[model samples]
Target: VLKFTTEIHPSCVTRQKVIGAGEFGEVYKGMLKTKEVPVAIKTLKAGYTEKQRVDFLGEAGIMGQFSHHNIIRLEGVISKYKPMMIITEYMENGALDKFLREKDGEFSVLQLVGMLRGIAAGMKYLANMNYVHRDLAARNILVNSNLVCKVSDFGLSRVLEDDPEATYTGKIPIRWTAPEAISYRKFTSASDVWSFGIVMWEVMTYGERPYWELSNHEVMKAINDGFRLPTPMDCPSAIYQLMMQCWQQERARRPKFADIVSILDKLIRAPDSLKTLADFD
Candidate 1:
């Protein structure tokens, strides 16, 4: 189990101070004390359905099995009693979505490239593990003072088998979803690549809300009707072309992360002015 020796304060134990919350439960940032050392704790919130409980616990189990630099560290779970809890390496910077939002109009192009590289590195790690991050979007990513991106929120991810049509919940960030996933409800790592492309756009745009001008209902309609974001005026043509390929209505057409990494590496190595022209008016 993920053990913490820090004294838990009653004030920080309540839901009101939760760092994040969803239908399943809340996430609290508390201090964990062990006999030897003290660390930050992230405990699961209250009032979850049986399915939610199982899902949360399952995520904890999967997270416990892996350790990677770019992936969020799942230290352990507190299963001492009912309403089991999870503990992880506390990320002081919080969600990628909020972080980018906070930096609205603040990140330079190269900075955005660096952020996307971190995300791609994390995705590459998961792909090597044969894991499919069903939800790979800015909101699920977390960043730190160093601007390193750590992939988080693994509740929706799952291991892939040989079956290509294996289905899971269709819940995903619409703007980041591959067309086939939106239309047919099937997903694959290729679809994940598609999502990553949108996330690239997100990082570049500094949290410009996805589907810029569309409402949820309209976004869904436009997606089903074959709409996608036009390349931003200042976005590199090569990079925008890459996004287009990934976002193609056909899932099989998406490039692999290996390919993505190569493209990004070249983009990063290119002159700063050419690589990040999108930052300028």
Candidate 2:
């Protein structure tokens, strides 16, 4: 339970420009008047009831308590004014998937691993705090000017009982989800690990689509038939092995985020160890 100051005067925020549309309302690129800092604002739509407003700001409340370099920082909220909003730190490069697509083949393997390392560290922090990011994907990660990846979009995340069998029956990110999570509605740190593996594939392929145009039903069937994603073009054998480990049928056998961090750290220290090509049979 982390305490946060939630009152942000509407006057303090300026230069709002529409960025995109969100579930609750419109998102904007804005600036904090006092410090001249750039921010991303998520505003609730007008003509909503009190319940709607609470539901809209729920993610802001969760983000306010989080303090990590690899997690987006919640600046404040404006519930008392018209067009209530949740403000957060702005990432110059925007979503990781789009960013990688724009600069495909521009980053080295080590650079990509560095980005994954940061995301793993952030996930470890969230896991430590008993939070499960139900939607962990490249698009959910924001990248800054320096290419640092920060995990964002906590609308689907929730604090669950740390039990391995804990389940939640809710809408989930289908393509990035684990088989158990999608089929049984079971969500845990292990499920998050499964998503992380998909994210690793995204990074390796420079934002290529998962499943290569397969329909949702087909993908599910393929996964259940012992089908795992093939290694991305030129992906390191070690990293691909880690992805296979994450995609294990038994969710309990997946590695924790902490273990992911250690593996990436070792890869960073000894880049040559990743030279082997991934085996595909």
Candidate 3:
């Protein structure tokens, strides 16, 4: 029975060199002395503000709440004193977006689909838990040395505002967020699907940024104007179809992550199924 999540005491952790930087501070590849398990520790940068500390632990709170092979594993939190740390399982390969870019053109379509399946599987698990990933993108998907993609970064998100002129509320991430989410503040699993479409684009393009060089507002306007990201030139027809389905304007029209996983699994099992390319209409 692997129901409840675990916690780690400070003494059990041995911090190492910086693996990545966070909004709080540097994240380290720390070692859990008790079991020699490697972990990524996100330490609070400097002086902690009430808001910073609360949300800092809040991410740990949220991540600790979820336990899945595809979801990033939370080892524990160090809230006892200074440098409050959020310890998670170490991902040596770092973010999926960067990882794919660095090794561009190296992976086969089947391998890429396998990674996408892992991501979809993770999202499906969260979808069933009644959890909505407000930020779902390839960048938020972390990769270990084994090429396993685990969904990461549980940040404090936003509340929907009816104001159309609200720039700061949901302006920056226009590329990944769904039209309904940005305009009306609807951050449901359907919105998550919209971003998953962007992630599929990212994976297919070797982590190319969506809308290349396009301004945020421009991208927002484009989506509102019914413009979705086109399939990458070499992308498989089946994959592109799934991406378009996820980007469906009608939230209800989007396929469930379960279906995404199912279709991807079938395709993954039959590589030739991905051999044919579809006409983009």
Candidate 4:
């Protein structure tokens, strides 16, 4: 049940010009089975090793048969023959990080918060399914022409078969990872909240890198000693307040994703509530 069964034939998918490059390789906008709609196709690079092949297909397995508006959908995969590919719905605007950076100062505070709310909704569904997305950075989220953001990049995800957590001694992206996750190799929905805080910071700053030029060890030490990110310029007090709550040193103190969704909805539905420079004032 953990694997995707919708396998498409390479003959049915015709790759066109390159659309974008990712950790995998160059992705293409192509015709999949039908000429009606275009699909973003990712081909398994030529001459990949056995371990690389496993890693490539693992992403498709983790995303098996799930449906969510805020989560990326894997259309199908091709492994029966050469030039294996992972077929997925194309996001017109591409990744959230680059999209934010390119459109900085163009989107309203309400729009930014709305995007965060979407991401939180996606994570909430994943958490309910006992799926831990170990990496929840904005870079992993895709944005479409409709400006809708979806949580993607399932390469680092895990399903907790028994508990609400999954321990990993493997390497994690330092800046976005929670303290307990960094120090103890533990990951849970709470850990994802910390990453969401970083994503909030990214959205506020128009995709500024977390910790800036600081080394990974510096971030770890500083966080270990109670340091946290400062508010971005002109960021709404309500948003920053939520960010701080997400960055709480104690994971249990962080609000749940559903609660985060409610909080953003409150601010979004009442635009005046976001005008305050201070959360209480």
1 or 2, greater by TM-score: 2
Give the whole-model CA lDDT for all candidates, comma-separated. Answer: 0.70, 0.85, 0.84, 0.83
Instruction: Evaluate model 4: give its TM-score.
Output: 0.89
**Native-to-model Cα distance after best TM-score fit, residue 154 in candidate 1, in Å:** 1.3
**What value does the lDDT take at residue 279 in candidate 1?**
35
lDDT of 1 by residue, 1-61 (tens): 4434332333333222467655666677665544332233445556656677778777777
lDDT (tens digit, per residue) of candidate 4 on 1-281: 45445988677888987977655556888887665577888887777767668988877777764689999888888877877888888898999999989898998888888888899999999998898888889988999887889998877433422223555422357788888877677889999999999999999999999999988888878888888898898799889999999999998899999999999998888988767765333
Model 4 segments beyond 4 Å from truth? 1-4, 21-25, 156-171, 279-281
RMSD list, candidates in order: 6.0, 4.3, 2.9, 4.7
TM-score of each: 0.78, 0.90, 0.91, 0.89
Please write out the lDDT profile of model 3 over residues 1-281, one tens digit for every residue.
23334556777888988877755688888788664888888888778678888877777788877879999998778888667888888898999988998999998888888899999999999989998988888878999887899999777744433345556522236678888888677789989988898899999999898999988788878877888888797799999999999988899999999899999999988889877887846
Ranked by TM-score from best down, the candidates are 3, 2, 4, 1
lDDT of 2 by residue, 1-281 (tens): 56774688888997469989855688899899765899888888897767667677777788887899999988899978887888998899999999999999998888998999999999999989898888789998999988899999888333322324566532455678888877777878899999999999999999998998888778889989999899898899999999989898898789999999999999999988767777656
lDDT of 4 at 46: 77
Question: What is the TM-score (0 to 1) of candidate 3?
Answer: 0.91
Residue-pair clash count for candidate 2: 0
Question: In model 3, what are the clashing residue pairs, if there are any?
Answer: none
